[PDB]
Amino acid sequence: SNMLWALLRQYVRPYRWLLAVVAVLQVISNMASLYLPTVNAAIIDDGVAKGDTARIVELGAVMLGVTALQVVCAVGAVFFGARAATGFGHDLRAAVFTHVTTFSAEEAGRFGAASLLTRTTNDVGHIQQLVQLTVTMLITAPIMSIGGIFMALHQDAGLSWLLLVSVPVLGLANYWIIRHLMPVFTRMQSLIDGINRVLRDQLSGIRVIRAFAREPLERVRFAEANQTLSDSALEAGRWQALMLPVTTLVINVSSVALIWFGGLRIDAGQMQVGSLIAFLAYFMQILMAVLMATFMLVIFPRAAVCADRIGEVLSTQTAITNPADPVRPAAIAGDIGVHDATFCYPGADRPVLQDVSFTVPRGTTTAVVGSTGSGKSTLISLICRLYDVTSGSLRIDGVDVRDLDIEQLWSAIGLVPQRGYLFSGTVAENLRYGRADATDDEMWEALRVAAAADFVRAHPQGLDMPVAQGGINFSGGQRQRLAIARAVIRRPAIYLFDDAFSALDVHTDARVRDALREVAADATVVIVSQRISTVIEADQVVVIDDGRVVGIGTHDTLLADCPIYAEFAESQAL
Template sequence: MLIRLLRTHLRPYHRPLAAVVLLQFVGTMASLYLPSLNADIIDLGVARGDTGYIVRTGGWMLAVSLVQIVCSVAAVYLGARTAMGFGRDVRAAVFGHVNRFSAREVARFGAPSLITRNTNDVQQVQMLVLMSCTMLVAAPIMSVGGVVMALREDLGLSWLMLVSVPALAVALWLVIRRMVPGFRLMQTRIDTVNRVLREQITGIRVVRAFVREPYETERFATANADLTATALRTGRLMALIFPVVMLVLNVSSVAVLWFGAQRVDAGAIQVGALTAFLQYLMQILMAVMMATFMLMMVPRAAVCAERIVEVLDTDSSVVPAPRPVTEVSAHAELELRGVGFQYPGAAAPVLRDVSFRVTPGTTTAIIGSTGAGKTTLLSLVPRLVDVTAGAVLVDGVDVRDLAPDELWRRIGLVPQKPYLFTGTVASNLRYGNPDATDDDLWAALEIAQARDFVEAMPEGLASPIAQGGTNVSGGQRQRLAIARALVRRPEIYLFDDSFSALDLGTDARLRAALRPVTADAAVVIVAQRVSTIVGADQIIVLENGGVVGMGRHDELLDTCPTYAEIVASQNTAGVPA
């Protein structure tokens, strides 16, 4: 998964990556040349007392060091730009893909997990790319070059490399392979902490209303403790790496000095060559250590890449048509033909054999007990989810065949839980139509019975709205959501229990103001309150996912026991809208 993610999203950066490799190669070769020059100064300059040779060779060392510095700085700069661009592209890809998900896929992953995958997980892979550009390229060059240069200085000590390098590599591999399950579990624990925290912050009113702060504190403490315990177990393994590296490094240094001193004493090697050999061995081991840093990051990045690719590989259950219809002749018509919907793996369908038609200028109301499938039914029209049986037709065309933009342009949806975005009143209303003028916004607010409270705000249309609309009341939030749909001026209005937070007087005034605006549109209203739908041209009564009644208010009182029971329970029979 990691290789696939890197190969896909690093393809546009092949030129910067090639430049990084070249710069790292030049810089590493320059660093490998320095110990040899240092050995020449000791063996040829100091031993002979040739000051001129020392100065000339020292000048070459300064020049080589300058090349190394320039190449390293340039490589790190290009590597950082490449890594940041890679992270940007992956985040954009994940965000764009998630935006195409239906409600089913979003519910499957969960919002906290999707946020973690697009932030923390992408950052882990991005850091791997950055470290690869700065370390991984240099490590093999330094290892191979160091071996060649060390053998050039003295073959007699080469056995030390054959012992120390494999010993370090094996020891590190034994530690790192135990870290992979820990990193995978850690990402899951992060998801859990994010989920609990999100639930507690979002539902803070419920928590306080039921005095559940101690319980929620304990629940978060449990999730936090699980994450901490997993991180500590993985951290202990990570901490073990450094002592292992230092042990092998120091033992190797002692061994080189011990056996090298014997060869110097025997005249088989000069002091400068021994010094160079020691430096090359240290460079080789440092290269192994740099590769170790990469190996420490690879397991976690691999887990994160697996989670990212899982999102990218998940296809939406709402798929655009191969040849979408972009032009239709009908206007403001909605029809459901034998519609059924069943969640994957569910024992029974949520909806079954639902059929009705909404014509221009008419209002159809949907009512039923909780769990009857009203919201699911309304979600099928804008394709938040797709039918599993039957068909939904907008203006005579199956919504699955319509171009998505064409479908959504014709629909104005006010969801059951209205959501407002961080910004202003105006920016939220223009979500329905970015080109709407201030006059259009005030007209929509007037119809939605929201003009009075918006005018009372200190800055009017420019008044700030907090995330989710938490700085306005539930009724105000509903009215702003209705105004947002009105600004769009769609052909089909879908109101999903959008009047529940309004008092009866405001409800009646709003519906009266809506009539002239929706005179040429198809209107579908899901409601729990009979007074909201009593004047509808057609009322659909749902029970256990099926239609048990269809007609006007007076007809259903006589023909549909379920509807009569709902009316009786609310004591509104015969009360006009």
């Protein structure tokens, strides 16, 4: 676990003089629990060995003061232990989120959207729950041993060799069991997550598994996961069964030799009798501090794989960044000039796009079209720099797009992605993203252009109906038209629709396009669609098939010149 420590020494840096106030209070709280037997050895030696009745009762005052000093610095240690372990976990996810927000589409989609939330919310909280458990209930095992040795040195140091020999063998016989247990214990968590995934896949596809009658294959691929998990959990419990017995045997043998080697001293007259009572409690306190500390070491293997994922997110250098000298035109009015752009995944056999070359003039409209998987899905995300072109160049009216500040680029591109996503809140704050200062009557214009006015106006509170988290209350084209209106009130120089009108029907698609043509009379519109009924009115249309372009023109000059486009539009008539 070289990543858990590299990620653990990095983010709890500011809380150095807040764990130094915990490792100095866990010392007072453990040298005060070791001092109660120390003073009990004086009750037995100064009040019991003699008559001295009052020395037993007046030495209980020292015991009552110590038990209060031991709790004021033990509840005052849990106040600073779970105050640096909450700053680590705050600063950790505040740095995971800040790094994720720098990702591009290619890097964000490589991790996901749920495997990236469970990597910053409940994944941090495992290392964050490890820090508050390793400074409040796990450093007391080394402390109760090291300070126990010094207490046994303070009291009749002649017989401190027992505690100098009994520990070096309690942390060495426990470092062997743990050394052999850790590798067999991190392999058991990757193996119980391999059966929770088999069950998850079987339950989700329980309707298709039965369709192929592939039930002899299931629960035989589950019988090889259950019987494999039960061989790594029956083996990790083969070492975990040696922790209590060996640790308690070391303490018991040390305790038994203690009375012999202490009686040999007491008979000689160089030792008192209460020292045995004190040492027998030092050993028992060390046993108690070691057993419960080694019983909660299950956290380390399960929080060292969380750190692997967090460090995998945090060690992903982004590849799309602003240039050191970005060109800043006064206006970025749409003129796209894609020349020879070839986008290829790293290591892929065939590039997604290859030698695509088309330009759109100032205020016209283009429509790219092709079969599923034929590149066009990735063409939109190149104009707004959600992907990097590998061996080509696209330029917007004066400059290569990657030689242009990405924020000023996005400030005049109204993007409507493949799936309409709306943010939690109200329609007034969901379609506010376009302008953020639009007047109330101005947001009634996009909803009319996007053919979305007649469902948000037929509501009690007008344009204030609450939207769900992902906008799931609006089922389909309702969400799509709200997303269209969001970009409609931005007056962009480039409208960029990526499979937007597919969710809509045919009449509302033609209505929205007519509204755009009557409103955005000079904006550059780039429409991507698998339909043809939304492509007729485009000023120019291009077809791309398996990457490369196959034909560029208008509808009439391409319906009788491109066989691919002809057979594309053939499956459209009724």
